[PDB]
């Protein structure tokens, strides 16, 4: 129903916020690894 869809959407969006945070952290480290690779 209406409330089930609305509430589950809110819970999905909270997980998605954490997901984006981890994507940011992961990409930042990938870029660091690439930079260190160039120093070799």
């Amino acid at each position, epitope marked *: 129903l209406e409330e089930e869809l609305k509430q589950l959407e809110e819970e999905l*969006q*909270a997980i998605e*916020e954490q997901l*984006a*945070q981890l994507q*940011w*952290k992961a*990409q*930042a480290r990938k870029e660091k690894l690439a*930079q260190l690779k160039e120093k070799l």
Partner: nanobody
Amino acid sequence: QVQLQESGGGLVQPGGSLRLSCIASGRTFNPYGMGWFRQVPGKERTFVSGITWIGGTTYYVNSVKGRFTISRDRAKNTVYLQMNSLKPEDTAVYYCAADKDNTGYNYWGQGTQVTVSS
């Protein structure tokens, strides 16, 4: 050993805009990335946007896509959040963050209040 100081908050009508800034100073500082989080009373801080320090790659949560833009300047160790098309539900304390090591904890500033009230 690094301090983070925000600026740019305030009170706008729905549809308005604000530009948040955050400057890092102290011991020499080269983070993995910086970002912005937000918090409403009684809840935990939630991610809003982040930028990688080397590449400048940006990330946004779905509720601000197409309205907010993050950027950074390595010369001044400063990160910015341009907040357009503001809505009442964006009302929160916005916090600046630095991803500096692998402890799982970021370094934070002291927050800036953003109020969107019709």
